[PDB]
């Protein structure tokens, strides 16, 4: 009663003289995780999820390697439960992005982590220990039609089927590294030294090898256009197919909200995901 | 999680 | 002198940071600049900077090697490694501090503080014997001998007869040593470079910081460098939980050990920092 006090054993292991009424636990999906002061400690909720828990270590352990201009969660410790490094630092509001030489050191540091991923995707030991799933958006489509169709009136029917259909459009790129969920809350940054300057990214639990315009969306969802065009035209991407890619990969993101929230019985995150749609 | 795709 | 010469790079790599309010290390070949969340590596001179590139390749694979804690992360981008020289290379800072070697008068915290250190020296040992690794690393032979030449020639000159003496019997020894290229080996795994966080609870590693030296060699210099910082009881203590408590090894420890504040002083010479010199040269005159 009390994940702390459930799991002191390995805890007095892993945090010896730690105090475990003194930490934290954030309640994820499949995993329970329990912060200290410089790493976390990810329990499997689910025999799924402990299943996996080795291979998951394996893909942080490639993340840990790359270059990709930050840090990222270092595995220290697997046994059974997965140590990572907490990455230091915080989110960077899109207040801050009004301040314009501001704006441009931080478009300047996404286009070094985008390059970095983007170049890892040709590596071997990446592309053989990441996830690359074939036709990830067909499924989707078929998972919205099958769960969220049900929940939706006629004209959100309507608009979420030319949605799905766009993506029937999409090349099915294997490119890059795409983090998979690059929203605001996961990129950290150390602030009051100087400008601010990126610390690393979090959250990886969706990372895949695909296409970028992914990262993109996500970038243009937490901070606006404008913000992603300073990032697409720094970065020399900022043509045509790549903005027809992204716009359609963005237009799915509520209903990807709404797919999780209907499988999580989180019903607040569910009303809001199907807004446009009902 | 939440419109970024969490 | 140093942050006068290089501001203007650095207010392109720390923007917005007053370069007087920094710190540097001195490197033999590079200046290491230190700012609150990363170090910048400056080099001195051109071959200096012809060695940033490969110097880049080595803290990307200490960066994915399984050693329980951090490392330095290079910041640029894989590219760079193919360069000819970088005018610079950006590595991510360790957090954490020093452990205070009285701390180790508890022996719980003596306990827990040996086996992280045993954690680190077998993911060190265990990449040693990678092939892909020993492959990346430098792994010069016959580094004993062409030491003790080098300590004689350098620092011989900056000792009296009597430092001179003390030295040519530690210096001895060297020659017997086996030339054991068995491990990845950081060269320099003082007590400074090995840092540790006690914000909660017993001493937990954090990393470990200042890669200049390290190589594919004898571990005996790793657990030599804990020797002569924490002493005989800790380092059996580090030996015994390791496995490494063998006489052959032991006997390697004992006779690296006995230079090893020669190691420091060779350094101090090559890098220009003078106190460092002049600790390394305690009782050497």
Same mark, same amino acid.
């Given at each position: #009663?009390?994940?702390?006090?459930?799991?002191?054993?390995?805890? @007095?292991?892993?945090?010896?003289?730690?105090?475990?009424?003194?930490? +934290?636990?954030?309640?994820?999906?499949?995993?329970?995780?329990?912060?200290?002061?410089?790493?976390?400690?990810?329990?499997?909720?689910?025999?799924?999820? &402990?299943?996996?828990? !080795? /291979?998951?270590?394996?893909? #942080? /352990?490639?993340?840990?390697?790359?270059?990709?201009?930050?840090?990222? !969660?270092?595995?220290?410790?697997?046994?059974?439960?997965?140590?990572?490094?907490?990455?230091? *630092?915080?989110?960077?509001?899109?207040?801050?992005?009004?301040? @314009?030489?501001?704006?441009?050191?931080?478009?300047?540091?996404?286009? +070094?982590?985008?390059?970095?991923?983007?170049?890892?995707?040709?590596?071997?030991?990446?592309?053989?220990?990441?996830?690359?799933?074939?036709? /990830? $958006?067909?499924?989707?489509?078929?998972?919205?039609?099958?769960?969220?169709?049900?929940? #939706?009136?006629?004209?959100?029917?309507?608009?979420?089927?030319?949605?799905?259909?766009?993506?029937?459009? =999409?090349?099915?790129?294997?490119?890059?590294?795409?983090?998979?969920?690059?929203? &605001?809350?996961?990129? =950290? $940054?150390? /602030?009051?030294?100087?400008?601010?300057?990126? @610390?690393?990214?979090?959250? $990886?639990?969706?990372?895949?090898?695909?296409?970028?315009?992914?990262?993109?969306?996500?970038? *243009?969802?937490?901070?606006?256009?404008?913000?992603?065009?300073?990032? =697409?035209? =720094?970065?020399? $991407?900022?043509?045509?197919? #790549?903005?027809?890619?992204? &716009?359609?990969?963005?237009? +799915?993101? &509520?209903?990807?909200?709404?797919?999780?929230?209907?499988?999580?019985?989180?019903?607040?995150?569910?009303?809001?995901?199907?807004?446009?749609?009902? | 999680?939440?419109?970024?795709?969490?």
């Amino acid at each position: #009663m009390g994940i702390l006090q459930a799991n002191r054993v390995l805890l @007095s292991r892993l945090l010896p003289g730690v105090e475990p009424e003194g930490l +934290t636990v954030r309640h994820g999906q499949f995993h329970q995780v329990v912060i200290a002061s410089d790493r976390v400690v990810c329990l499997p909720r689910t025999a799924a999820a &402990a299943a996996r828990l !080795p /291979r998951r270590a394996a893909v #942080m /352990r490639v993340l840990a390697g790359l270059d990709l201009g930050c840090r990222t !969660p270092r595995p220290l410790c697997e046994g059974p439960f997965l140590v990572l490094s907490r990455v230091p *630092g915080a989110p960077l509001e899109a207040d801050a992005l009004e301040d @314009s030489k501001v704006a441009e050191v931080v478009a300047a540091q996404y286009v +070094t982590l985008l390059s970095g991923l983007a170049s890892a995707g040709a590596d071997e030991k990446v592309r053989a220990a990441l996830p690359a799933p074939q036709g /990830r $958006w067909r499924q989707f489509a078929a998972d919205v039609r099958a769960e969220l169709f049900p929940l #939706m009136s006629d004209g959100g029917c309507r608009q979420a089927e030319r949605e799905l259909a766009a993506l029937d459009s =999409l090349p099915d790129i294997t490119e890059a590294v795409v983090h998979g969920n690059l929203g &605001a809350e996961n990129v =950290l $940054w150390v /602030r009051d030294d100087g400008l601010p300057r990126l @610390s690393g990214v979090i959250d $990886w639990d969706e990372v895949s090898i695909g296409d970028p315009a992914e990262d993109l969306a996500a970038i *243009g969802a937490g901070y606006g256009k404008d913000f992603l065009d300073q990032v =697409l035209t =720094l970065g020399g $991407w900022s043509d045509r197919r #790549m903005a027809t890619r992204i &716009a359609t990969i963005r237009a +799915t993101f &509520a209903l990807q909200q709404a797919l999780s929230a209907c499988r999580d019985g989180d019903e607040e995150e569910l009303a809001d995901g199907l807004t446009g749609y009902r | 999680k939440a419109x970024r795709a969490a």
